[PDB]
From a paper:
We determined the crystal structures and thermostability of a set of N-terminally extended peptides bound to [name]*0801, and monitored the trimming of these peptides by [name] both in their free and [name] I–bound forms. To eliminate possible issues with peptides dissociating from the [name]*0801 groove during trimming by [name], we introduced a Lys-to-Cys mutation at P7 in AAKKKYKL and also introduced the complementary Glu76 → Cys mutation in [name]*0801. Based on AAKKKYCL, we produced the nested set of N-terminally extended 10-, 12-, 14-, and 20-mer peptides (RA)nAAKKKYCL that can be covalently bound to [name]*0801E76C. Our structures revealed that the N-terminally extended peptides bind into the [name] I groove by adopting noncanonical conformations with residue extensions protruding out of the A pocket.
The structures show that the 8-amino acid AAKKKYCL core of all peptides, even the very long 20-mer, zigzags in the groove in an almost identical manner to the 10-mer. There was, however, a noticeable upward shift of the backbone from P1 to P3 for the 12-, 14-, and 20-mers relative to the 10-mer: Cα-atom shifts of ∼2.0 Å at P1 and ∼0.44 Å at P3. The electron density for all peptides was well-defined over the AAKKKYCL core and P−1 Ala. It is noteworthy that partial electron density for P−2 Arg was visible at 0.5σ for the 12-, 14-, and 20-mers, which was not the case, however, for the 10-mer. Nonetheless, we have omitted all residues starting at P−2 Arg from our final models. The structures also showed that all P1 Ala residues had undergone a rotation within the A pocket, as exemplified in Fig. 2B with the 12-mer. Furthermore, in all structures, because P1 Ala residues are less deeply anchored within the A pocket relative to the 10-mer, this created a large cavity that was filled by a water molecule. This water molecule makes the conventional H-bonds to Tyr7 and Tyr171. In the 12-, 14-, and 20-mer structures, Arg62 swings out and up from its canonical position, which opens the A pocket. Although the position of Arg62 in the longer peptides is different from that seen in the 10-mer, and small differences are seen between the 12-, 14-, and 20-mers, all orientations generated an open-ended groove. Thus, these structures further support the view that Arg62 plays a critical role in modulating the “open” and “closed” forms of the A pocket.
Numbering used by the authors:
A (entry chain B): 1 to 99
B (entry chain A): 1 to 275
C (entry chain C): 1 to 9
The structure:
């Protein structure tokens, strides 16, 4: 039995163009725990990405937060790319400052 | 308010790629304060909150030893579980554990916890009485009989009523400036037209701690549970949490909708509308 | 110590 991840991509602080911030990709609700997560800037993998220690919710499903410094702008696009045994191909969720 | 201390342990086998990884993380409420990972270059109980750093080397040394032993115990458990379910040596499997205690405002024990899941499914739990077990299936019944024979519940009870509560009280005192501080949500409502006919109202809650929160939309005072999109509460990375709730509303009807926010850090619950 | 001794399932 497997559970596919929920994915949210968002910033630590309210987004202001040109102001440094942190970009978060939160993956949750998944089982088993092996999961591949990349943060993307204009389609390319960001190298400086850290993550939380593996933990889980009361329903036993796992969650991780991946994060990195970023400075949002008008033109730059950010996204999170996730692969899991439940997914036949990597899922990409774009950063939208309204979500 | 009330508080909890919980350890969340994951052990996962990986045939052909070494021995099962064991990771244990400890929390007080929604604040992680320790981690141990057998895959760390030099495994040891490591501090993950500033208020725990004041504990001396005896705290670190003793807990590191318990966690190194727990690594071996969880590997034994995984071997045994594979047999209980007649499973192949070829597959990967997961054992998870949660244990710890809840106290009230006065520091008195509310209840204790010690329970396990295998491959994502509940397997065995210590009952609230801290004396008996609930086994999910015939495999867990083997564990139950073994633990009954060895009087394991008595040791767990002693830990949960004694050590767990004592340390939780200590942690809450040492970390009182943060663990006992509830930060209220900063809230706002945004409005996003969808079409000529409809718009999204999104109610935001940012910067709150602890994570528990209630965000709801009402239309003319009636709850809109079915028509509300609620995202899972998510960590900001600065200790605090975020959440939003959205409803699709007919153009011109925005003022019939109210967002209601309940949270421990708010003097009073909030009622927000657009603009 | 703070952490719990675990028992083999």
């Amino acid at each position: 039995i497997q559970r596919t991840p929920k994915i949210q991509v968002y910033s630590r602080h309210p987004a202001e163009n040109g102001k440094s911030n942190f970009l978060n990709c939160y993956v949750s609700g998944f089982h088993p725990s092996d999961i591949e997560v990349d943060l993307l800037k204009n389609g390319e993998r960001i190298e400086k990405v850290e993550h939380s220690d593996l933990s889980f919710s009361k329903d036993w499903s796992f969650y991780l937060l991946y994060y990195t410094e970023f400075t949002p702008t008008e033109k730059d696009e950010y996204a999170c790319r996730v692969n899991h045994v439940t997914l036949s191909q990597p899922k990409i969720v774009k950063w939208d400052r309204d979500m | 308010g009330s508080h909890s201390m919980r350890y969340f342990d994951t052990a996962m086998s990986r045939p052909g790629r070494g021995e099962p990884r064991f990771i244990s993380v400890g929390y007080v409420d929604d604040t992680q304060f320790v981690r141990f990972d057998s895959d760390a270059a030099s495994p040891r109980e490591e501090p993950r909150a500033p208020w725990i750093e004041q504990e001396g080397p005896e705290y670190w040394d003793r807990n590191t030893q318990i966690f190194k032993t727990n690594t071996q115990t969880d590997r034994c458990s995984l071997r045994n579980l594979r047999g209980y379910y007649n499973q192949s040596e070829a597959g990967s499997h997961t054992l998870q554990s949660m244990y710890g205690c809840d106290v009230g405002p006065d520091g008195r024990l509310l209840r204790g916890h010690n329970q396990y899941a295998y491959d994502g499914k509940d397997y065995i739990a210590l009952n609230e009485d801290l004396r008996s077990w609930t086994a999910a299936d015939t495999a867990a019944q083997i564990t139950q009989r073994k633990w009954e024979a060895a009087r394991v519940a008595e040791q767990d009870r002693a830990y949960l009523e004694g050590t767990c509560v004592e340390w939780l009280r200590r942690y809450l005192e040492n970390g009182k400036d943060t663990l006992e501080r509830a930060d209220p949500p900063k809230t706002h409502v945004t409005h996003h037209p969808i079409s000529d006919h409809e718009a999204t109202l999104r109610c935001w809650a940012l910067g709150f701690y602890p994570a528990e929160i209630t965000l709801t939309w009402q239309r003319d005072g009636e709850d809109q549970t079915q028509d509300t999109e609620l995202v899972e509460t998510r960590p900001a990375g600065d200790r605090t949490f975020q959440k939003w709730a959205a409803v699709v509303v007919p153009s011109g009807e925005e003022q019939r909708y109210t967002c209601h926010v309940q949270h421990e850090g708010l003097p009073k619950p909030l009622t927000l509308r657009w603009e | 110590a703070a952490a719990k001794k675990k028992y083999c399932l």
